């Protein structure tokens, strides 16, 4: 019933380079609200903590996007995926693989769009990512 | 499977927009461009051009949305004329526009993000072409709200074709030729973008 406060507590959705970073200037006013992490076509995307899958749909730009509720209105988002490995309603425990990376928003290079929202509001995720 | 471009002739009927010192009226420019743009888009098999306003009447912000939605528009282009106090202020401009409850929001908040991006890229493209036929009063895309009301789903740009306040540009904006050139530009602008990022 909550991600709790950032403390390298949570699993890395996927491991690799941080291609784009929370806050990174995109263009004009627009600046990233997630991280783009590098990974191979079809690398297994793991759920950062314990929670329930509340969404798995295909969003223009962000490819197929899974979203996991952890409580409070703390949730994790995972986009650019080719395919999900769970269905809305499913319960997922941290570590559990929930998607497979693609370029499905990446466009240019296999990657994961990973975002955390706390009070449904997008924050820098990094401080949660521990081991 | 065609890309659907809503062309929104700014102002209309009751509201003339800005009127030049020579008495030419924003509304009668915007529509005259918008039709030339529809022609250039429907000419291109990649695109279908459709109008939010298709004659001289008033139509609310909302209504221009509801038309573009009811025409399943994939992207929207509003056409306007700028006008300043400073009568020698001239030049084209381009504007980029906007709009479990914690998921409810999150999805809109992503789509906002995409829209805003496509918008900006298209704006860039467009200015690109506009600066070939005129000068720009702003060479970067200016972010703003107002129109689009609440389309986080459909990206939109506003093209200030020039300053109808400026006795010179007024005459160009009343020029079939130059309206054509503006249409051509705004078109090439989209073409260049969607060419490179087709609807996949
Ligand atoms: Zn106007």
Numbering used by the authors:
A (entry chain B): 297 to 427
B (entry chain A): 190 to 288, 322 to 422
Authors' own words:
Peptidoglycan amidases are key hydrolytic enzymes that are needed to break the peptidoglycan layer during cell division to allow for separation of daughter cells. All the three division-associated amidases have overlapping enzymatic functions in hydrolyzing the peptidoglycan amide bond between the sugar and the first amino acid of the peptide cross-link. In their resting states, zinc-dependent peptidoglycan amidases such as AmiB and AmiC adopt autoinhibited conformations in which their active sites are blocked by an alpha helix containing a conserved glutamate residue which binds to the active-site zinc. The activators share a common motif, the LytM domain, which forms the proposed site of amidase binding and activation.
After extensive crystallization trials, we were ultimately successful in solving a crystal structure of the AmiB hydrolytic domain bound to the EnvC LytM domain using proteins from Citrobacter rodentium. First, the EnvC LytM domain is bound directly to the amidase interaction helix, with the latter’s hydrophobic residues all pointing directly into the LytM groove. Second, the amidase regulatory domain has a very different conformation in the EnvC-bound structure such that the interaction helix is contiguous with helix 5 and the blocking helix is displaced from the active site. Finally, the active-site zinc is ligated by three residues rather than the five due to the absence of the blocking helix glutamate (Glu167 in AmiA) and dissociation of one of the aspartates (Asp271 in AmiB, equivalent to Asp135 in AmiA). The structure of the EnvC–LytM AmiB complex shows that the amidase interaction helix binds within the same groove as the restraining arm, lending further support for this mechanism. Additionally, the activator–amidase structure further identifies a distinctive loop (C. rodentium EnvC residues G319–G330) that contacts residues located between the interaction helix and helix 5. The extended loop wraps around the residues located between the interaction helix and helix 5, causing them to form a single, continuous, helical element. In the EnvC LytM AmiB costructure, the angles between neighboring ligating residues and the zinc are all close to 109°, suggesting a tetrahedral coordination state in which the fourth position remains open for substrate binding and catalysis. Inspecting the density surrounding the zinc, a low-occupancy ligand is present at the fourth position of the coordination sphere.
